[PDB]
Amino acid sequence: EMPYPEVIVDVGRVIFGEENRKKMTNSCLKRSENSRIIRAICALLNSGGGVIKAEIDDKTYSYQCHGLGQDLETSFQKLLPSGSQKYLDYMQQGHNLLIFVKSWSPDVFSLPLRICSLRSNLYRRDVTSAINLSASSALELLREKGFRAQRGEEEDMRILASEFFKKDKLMYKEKLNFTASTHVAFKRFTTKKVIPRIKEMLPHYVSAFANTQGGYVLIGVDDKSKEVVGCKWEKVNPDLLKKEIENCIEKLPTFHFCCEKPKVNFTTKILNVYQKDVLDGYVCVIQVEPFCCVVFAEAPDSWIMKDNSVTRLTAEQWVVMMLDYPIKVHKFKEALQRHLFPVTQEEVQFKPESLCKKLFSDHKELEGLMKTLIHPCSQGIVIFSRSWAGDVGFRKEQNVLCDALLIAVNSPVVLYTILIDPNWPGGLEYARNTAHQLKQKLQTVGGYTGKVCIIPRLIHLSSIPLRYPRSYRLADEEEMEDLLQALVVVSLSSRSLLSDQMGCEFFNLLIMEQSQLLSESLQKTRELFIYCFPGVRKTALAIKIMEKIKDLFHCKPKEILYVCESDSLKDFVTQQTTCQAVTRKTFMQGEFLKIKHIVMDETENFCSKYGNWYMKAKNITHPKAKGTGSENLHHGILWLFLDPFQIHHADVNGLPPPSAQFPRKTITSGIHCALEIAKVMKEEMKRIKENPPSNMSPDTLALFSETAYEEATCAQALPGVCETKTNLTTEQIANYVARKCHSLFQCGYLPKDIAILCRRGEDRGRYRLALLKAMELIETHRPSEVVFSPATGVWGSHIVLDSIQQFSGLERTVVFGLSPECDQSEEFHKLCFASRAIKHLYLLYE
């Protein structure tokens, strides 16, 4: 029933036509419907953007033949002071009129107003006028009064109304010579019902002589030439003002920047007049001292919808909205977009590649007429996935198979839906929902200040369209640039597959900027000891420094050398760079006589049982061209990579007896894990600090400081998933662990992207038992086969069964777990797992 994407606010029989905006003499219903339209439009404008539905006034109405009018567009012009041509679009459809709005996100070339208001309800005092304020003047007043509260003929006449204040006995009609200034107002009303006149006149003047200067308010004196006229003593009485002026000035909403909260200092007093024993009137005087903070007239005009209805705000709800991962994405966003989603003039591109290889594999007919279903066109990107609402965060539906999101130049963004079973009441509603929560992210998280719409459609490829006002489509290259950029920002903030496809390029773009700042220090020092945190990616950062070493030193690409421990991280470091990568059983064995420098990694793994490493490294390179036999004194480079918190080898290296002291650089600006994976490490690091083991020296914990993480973690980590499972012994896990991994690779994860990690690495061949064949006990659901190869478990496209000590350093996206309860005291294995997973961590602690 009426498939639509966005927040409909049903209004009624309001009239967007010139004949009624010129003709209508019945002004009451006209102003009521005008106030309703302005309130609903500004409500959706300030809340989240969206679509406004309205009805039709005339039976042969059209937008072109009737125009818009004068009153409504003048109201819209006063509501929007910067520009109305970026947030207001119209259309008509049958017995329907359709208005569009957008999120009020101001650009960087204007004053920051977070929400717009009609009138800010904060009155000030000019020379003679009590004016209402716009958004900018209210913002500068709030900033000025906040900075003042955080810190701690013109002025003549001000002291002349003090004589009028302390008078108590006044002669009738006496035009005393004080006039209007920046400290006195003297506005009179002499009506019959004098109570609501107080609450419509002074909430203004009481704040006017509280946000500028001073204060004095009179009742009973005309405003032409400071004339007193008085009234008859039956019409005016000296009692009927004070009973309700107090009830007036108590309900004014008030905000306070301070904490020693005062109140408004009303000092009202009534004066009398006696001349010739015949009375002819009196004067009422109100004294208001200056206020330390802001005082509002009424409830502010910032209308924001709530609970699917229109709602009014309060003052304390107004000030906090009038005033005030997340940083580097917005910097590297353009280089991410120009590499992952390139926009050129070739044919259309099915951009998520790993899902299209599965959809072609299982459902041969589905990847056929799908190319014929969109349009014959060239400029475009198709993002093909499973449930996009569940990708951006929602419940997934069991019936839905796939959906597509199409971005093109002169074509709107659409969203098709593939459905297997004919669930027509249960499908289209879901097809509506993803066309809302995908836009309200791309205009909030992504920061796209542009007009875009996503149209829901259902295709049902197992065997009444809408309309949009021809400007919500894209225009040229630069708008599709911004839309793909905002989609990159949104996809790097949700738990999906496309997040894991973008985070690697984001990490590489960060590693380049970190290696630049290390190459800046390459100019100054020759030696450097680097103290790393758990999760630093020393291996990714130690590759980009070698090209800077070569480009700055002007030497050969063979004269730079790299030291590792095992063959596992010797692989994948043999590629991706140009150096002589060796193991610990090889750098202790290789006789490098044409060495020039040393840039090593994994410094915590050196055995003192056979030979030495530090003495050999300080006997190979530290005897460089020194001594009197060589005038050439070129100096070498010894960059070690110490991970001191994760020291687990009790044999002495030669670094602890000098405590590894040299020119230091603790790099707390390198961390690449998930936001919950880093939180598990944050929770686990402060257990060893409060309880060190029997082998670790507690002197190395002074270099670590708290609040280095959750600032570095807040600046350089990404969201993801982190699961847990309880009470699975190895007999109980024999059928439970197979089911949770069967549905994983259907979502787009390649079998290269996942890895089954196991605790007990000494039972490795036994761990080829009880899982691999158990994996076969879940391969009897889809006809296929799997191969597990722990020997060449680095570059195989198949799933790699690997251990924590067998698979060190190199990372992967999806990491599994299995843990029998080994010891009651040995709780160190949790320190291993989350040091290797990137985004998706599935862990089974038992």
Q: Which residues are annotated as a binding site for ATP?
A: 532-539
Nearest to its own copies of 527, 706 (CB atom): 527
In the set 13, 243, 524, 594, which binds its own copies (CB under 8 A)? 524
Q: Does 264 bind Zn ion (CB under 5 A)?
A: no
Distance between CA atoms of 518 and 533, rounded to whole angstroms? Answer: 16
DSSP notation for 131-181:
E---HHHHHHHHHHHHHHHHH---STTGGGHHHHHT-S-B-TT---S----
Cβ neighbour number for residue 84 with a 10 Å cutoff = 12
Nearest distance from residue 262's CB to Zn ion, in Å? 6
Query: Among residue numbers 287 through 346, which ones bind Zn ion (CB under 5 A)?
Result: 292-293
Nearest distance from residue 517's CB to its own copies, in Å? 15
In the set 240, 258, 517, 552, which binds Zn ion (CB under 5 A)? 258
Q: Does 2 bind its own copies (CB under 8 A)?
A: no
Residue type, 571: D
| Among 6-14, 120-128, 604-612, 675-683, the segment contacting its own copies (CB under 8 A) | 120-128
In the set 10, 155, 200, 250, which binds its own copies (CB under 8 A)? 155
Q: Does 324 bind its own copies (CB under 8 A)?
A: no
Q: Does 774 bind Zn ion (CB under 5 A)?
A: no
Contact 483, 448 (CB under 8 A): yes
Binding residues: 532-539
φ/ψ (deg, to 5) at 674: -80, 170
| Cα separation values, 347 from 42, 86, 408, 649, 766, Å | 42, 31, 11, 57, 51
In the set 256, 363, 725, 764, which binds Zn ion (CB under 5 A)? 256
| Among 63-71, 268-276, 321-329, 709-717, the segment contacting its own copies (CB under 8 A) | 63-71
Nearest to Zn ion of 86, 256 (CB atom): 256
Nearest to Zn ion of 40, 293 (CB atom): 293
- By a kind-dependent CB cut-off of 5 to 8 A, residue 64 interacts, out of its own copies, Zn ion, none, with its own copies
Residue 90 CA neighbour count, 13 Å, CB half: 14
Nearest to its own copies of 179, 437 (CB atom): 179
Output the six-digit token pair for 395: 């419940």
| Among 151-159, 253-261, 305-313, 550-558, the segment contacting Zn ion (CB under 5 A) | 253-261
446: left (phi over 0), alpha (psi -120 to 50) or beta: alpha
Nearest to its own copies of 70, 589 (CB atom): 70
- By a kind-dependent CB cut-off of 5 to 8 A, residue 105 interacts, out of its own copies, Zn ion, none, with none
Cβ neighbour number for residue 421 with a 10 Å cutoff = 13
SS3 806: coil
Nearest to Zn ion of 88, 264 (CB atom): 264
Nearest to Zn ion of 292, 675 (CB atom): 292
DSSP notation for 370-388:
HHHHH-S-SSEEEEEES-H
Nearest to its own copies of 153, 826 (CB atom): 153
Binding mask 304-323 for its own copies (x = CB under 8 A): --------------------
Cβ neighbour number for residue 426 with a 10 Å cutoff = 13
Binding mask 644-663 for its own copies (x = CB under 8 A): -------------xxx-x-x
Query: Among residue numbers 173 through 202, which ones bind its own copies (CB under 8 A)?
Result: 177-180, 182
Residues binding Zn ion: what is the number (CB under 5 A)? 4
| Cα separation values, 226 from 180, 188, 457, 561, Å | 9, 11, 72, 94
| Among 81-89, 280-288, 494-502, 507-515, the segment contacting its own copies (CB under 8 A) | 81-89
Nearest distance from residue 314's CB to Zn ion, in Å? 18
Distance between CA atoms of 696 and 694, rounded to whole angstroms? Answer: 6
Residues 6 or more apart whose CB falls under 8 angstroms from that of 638 comprise 526, 527, 597, 598, 617, 621, 622
Nearest distance from residue 255's CB to Zn ion, in Å? 9
In the set 78, 251, 269, 526, which binds its own copies (CB under 8 A)? 526
- By a kind-dependent CB cut-off of 5 to 8 A, residue 92 interacts, out of its own copies, Zn ion, none, with its own copies
Write b or e for each residue in 232-241: b if 16 or more Cβ atoms lie within 10 A of its Cβ, otherwise e: eeeebeeeeb
Element (H, E) at 22: helix 18-23
Nearest to its own copies of 549, 800 (CB atom): 549
Residue with tokens 């994976």: 677
Query: Among residue numbers 660 through 689, which ones bind its own copies (CB under 8 A)?
Result: 661, 663-665
Contact 445, 311 (CB under 8 A): no
In the set 29, 31, 147, 787, which binds its own copies (CB under 8 A)? 147
Residues 540, 546, 548, 554: what is their CA dihedral angle, to the nearest 10 degrees?
A: -170
Nearest to its own copies of 422, 663 (CB atom): 663
Nearest to its own copies of 32, 162 (CB atom): 162
Distance between CA atoms of 660 and 531, rounded to whole angstroms? Answer: 10
Nearest distance from residue 351's CB to its own copies, in Å? 26
Distance between CA atoms of 812 and 568, rounded to whole angstroms? Answer: 14
Write b or e for each residue in 327-351: b if 16 or more Cβ atoms lie within 10 A of its Cβ, otherwise e: eebeebbeebbeebbebeeeebebb
| Cα separation values, 288 from 203, 220, 283, Å | 12, 18, 16
φ/ψ (deg, to 5) at 131: -95, 155
In the set 81, 342, 393, 426, which binds its own copies (CB under 8 A)? 81
Residue 129 CA neighbour count, 13 Å, CB half: 3
Contact 55, 95 (CB under 8 A): yes
Query: What is the separation, in whole angstroms, between the first and last Cα of the chain?
Result: 50
Q: Does 64 bind its own copies (CB under 8 A)?
A: yes
Q: Does 361 bind its own copies (CB under 8 A)?
A: no
- By a kind-dependent CB cut-off of 5 to 8 A, residue 609 interacts, out of its own copies, Zn ion, none, with none
Q: Does 65 bind its own copies (CB under 8 A)?
A: yes
Nearest to its own copies of 78, 331 (CB atom): 78
In the set 110, 516, 589, 724, which binds its own copies (CB under 8 A)? 110
- By a kind-dependent CB cut-off of 5 to 8 A, residue 73 interacts, out of its own copies, Zn ion, none, with its own copies
Residue type, 482: D
Q: Does 137 bind its own copies (CB under 8 A)?
A: yes
Nearest to its own copies of 429, 476 (CB atom): 476
Q: Are strands 561-563 and 580-582 parallel, antiparallel or unpaired?
A: parallel
Reference 538, options 644, 395, 430; nearest CA is: 644
Nearest distance from residue 133's CB to Zn ion, in Å? 19
Binding site for Zn ion (CB under 5 A): 256, 258, 292-293
Contact positions toward its own copies, by CB under 8 A? 63-65, 67-68, 70, 73, 76-77, 81-82, 84-85, 89-92, 107, 109-111, 125-129, 131, 136-137, 140, 143-144, 147, 151-157, 177-180, 182, 212-213, 469-471, 478, 523-527, 633, 635, 657-659, 661, 663-665
